[PDB]
Design a binder for this molecule. Sequence first.
Ligand SMILES: O=C(O)CCC(=O)C(=O)O
Ligand SMILES: O=C(O)CCC(=O)C(=O)O
Ligand SMILES: [Cu+2]
Ligand SMILES: [Cu+2]
Lengths: 312, 312
Amino acid sequence: MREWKIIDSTLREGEQFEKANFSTQDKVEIAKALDEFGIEYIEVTTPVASPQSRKDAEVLASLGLKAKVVTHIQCRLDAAKVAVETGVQGIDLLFGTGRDIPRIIEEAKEVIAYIREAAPHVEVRFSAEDTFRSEEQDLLAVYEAVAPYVDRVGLADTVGVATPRQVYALVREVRRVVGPRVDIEFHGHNDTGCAIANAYEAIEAGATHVDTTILGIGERNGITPLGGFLARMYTLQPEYVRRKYKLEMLPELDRMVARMVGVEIPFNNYITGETAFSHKAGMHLKAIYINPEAYEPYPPEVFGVKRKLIIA
Amino acid sequence: MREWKIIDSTLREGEQFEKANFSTQDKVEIAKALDEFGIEYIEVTTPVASPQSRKDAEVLASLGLKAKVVTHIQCRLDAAKVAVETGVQGIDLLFGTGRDIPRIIEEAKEVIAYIREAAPHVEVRFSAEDTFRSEEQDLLAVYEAVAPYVDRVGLADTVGVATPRQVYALVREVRRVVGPRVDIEFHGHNDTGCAIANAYEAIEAGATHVDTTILGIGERNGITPLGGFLARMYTLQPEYVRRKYKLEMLPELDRMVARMVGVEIPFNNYITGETAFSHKAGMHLKAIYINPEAYEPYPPEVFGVKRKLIIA
Ligand SMILES: O=C(O)CCC(=O)C(=O)O
Ligand SMILES: O=C(O)CCC(=O)C(=O)O
Ligand SMILES: [Cu+2]
Ligand SMILES: [Cu+2]
């Protein structure tokens, strides 16, 4: 342990997906299914975006889910006011990208102090945008000063270019300065194919929370996908992962979102793709007959799917 | 540098894709386009598989490509004989997965010695299957003893479960025992979402050759995809990558293979997916107007595609 939780962002980052147009009912359906699956947090679009985004946050936060519903806002006093009024259980602050550090620290602590005052039970996370490309002394100076006032700090690979040893190194340094009590969240884009690998390295370095979306939908090619992330963690912590989540629901989660946003599940999609458990080579087929574990990273039945043998 | 080459395996690993059924002409088309693109090696199915696979290897090796054509066989004398007779420029040996090490070394060196004798100009690579899960002392003992007799050794994450720091560590240890002259190849499956990240870590650790396939097609959910790998390497070595390959051909490569194997390019596919350069968030759109580099990991025009702004 290696203890960690997932923050699903399908109703925040996922809304930024090109073809996403979630009705209030779509969002409630998604949130209930995630809650059934056992997701620990559900993050939703800032209530400042539109009157409908506000309403959606208000409903989602009041559904009586076991998952904590949290909203994502700019690190500003005016947004924070709207946020607390929605009744969310958490607020995820993003400090957006030659300006002095004490001031940045002062600005952040002001917003955070407002929240503690207006709603002492709401969990507060603070992230700086584009965390891995920020100059590191100043980044750590800000995180060190803000951490005693927040429940969680986050790191965001905003443009999807962080590398895995880079993520590992910077998460370790953050954990050093913020200490053991403060949680650590990782959000990573998939532009260079490293979202799942980077989330895994973040956890190895001490991160406690990983952002995912169903099918990885999000801005551009999106972020760490739920299924791919669970495949990665299952092979390392099968007992933990199987206990935490209803893994056999993964195909229904992926189908639901694919249907709503108007895409096909990629042919090679982790676990649920057409091809994820297809075997063809003679020597592979030979071994799978004695033991399918021979060429399978995890059992298809765990995730509610089946293998295919191409003996043709 | 950070010098490296790509071994495309679309005509070997890619043939193991569930829906692959390449005619001889499909393979020639693919090989010529890869050669135009500037791929350094093209790996093809063992000639032992069928009379048609033999013929295909014979044709491909004789196309007069600038790329070296190499075939992939079991580490056996009988296969090696068929292999040399095809005229390929390289042979990629795979030693397939409580049996003693001197014997394994003897068996391998016998096959390798046959090749040197029968065809001294053919490049020989040796890999042990499932390299990252093999007990490491014995694995290094075999690689150390075989390396002086081969041009290249390879490591294969056969079941797609290696982790990035694991790949980095084992490539470094292999480089230690084989020395600087012997090349090092990485082949990684994508079952846990780490194929691109693991190939990148392999190169950082000293690997010189990475196996890819177009769209990552292959057994199960396949291997490191060409486009995703190039996106990852471009952000780190833009000058090198742009000089090495005709990057604007990537959409045609992905389209060609998707058409042949009967799949759609995934909606979120690296670079060439419907969604790879779609922007939606207001603050993102705001910044992209001043500078698209603000939320883009690489320029779409480099790879012959265009961005999308969802201002709606
Ligand atoms: O608040 C965060 O950590 C993530 C914000 C975001 O979507 C990004 O920077 O990519
Ligand atoms: O020869 C190799 O390195 C790769 C063989 C293969 O496809 C695998 O082990 O996954
Ligand atoms: Cu994001
Ligand atoms: Cu393979």
